[PDB]
Amino acid sequence: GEIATILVENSISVIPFSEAQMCEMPVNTPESPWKVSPEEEQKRKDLRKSHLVFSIDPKGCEDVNDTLSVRTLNNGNLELGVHIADVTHFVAPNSYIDIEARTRATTYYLADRRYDMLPSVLSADLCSLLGGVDRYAVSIM
């Protein structure tokens, strides 16, 4: 009852989404999971072999943002780069996920649980840097 009061009073929604707000999902099905269409592999510039990416992350970090990488080149100097996840492909302009995000401006945190801005598997498998599967990103360098 107290948690419910804190939600209602502080203007935060606890309603899961509707059919047409749900249905517009990336299909991470076992019979056909997600894997990059090769023309976008052309159009991008892979680094999954020639450079190391890892991350420290807080206990319970089911959803990573922060990544970096520093190596040495064929000369001896130290190239610096910070790599942030490029989640812009699943929120199209004037969408329903985009109006939704425009409404819920900031993710609210109370100290038991989080509250996903997105539906609860769109990012909480498909956006989090886990495992060693492929993941669109943006690496400044």
């Binding site: 943002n65 910070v82 812009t88 995000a101 900031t106 943006v138």
Partner: peptide, 18 residues
């Protein structure tokens, strides 16, 4: 710019940088 997921100004920044 390190959080396009849990905020909203960061998706703005994403759209603009891209």
């Amino acid at each position: 710019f390190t959080s396009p997921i849990r905020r909203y100004s960061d998706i703005v920044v994403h759209r603009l940088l891209m």
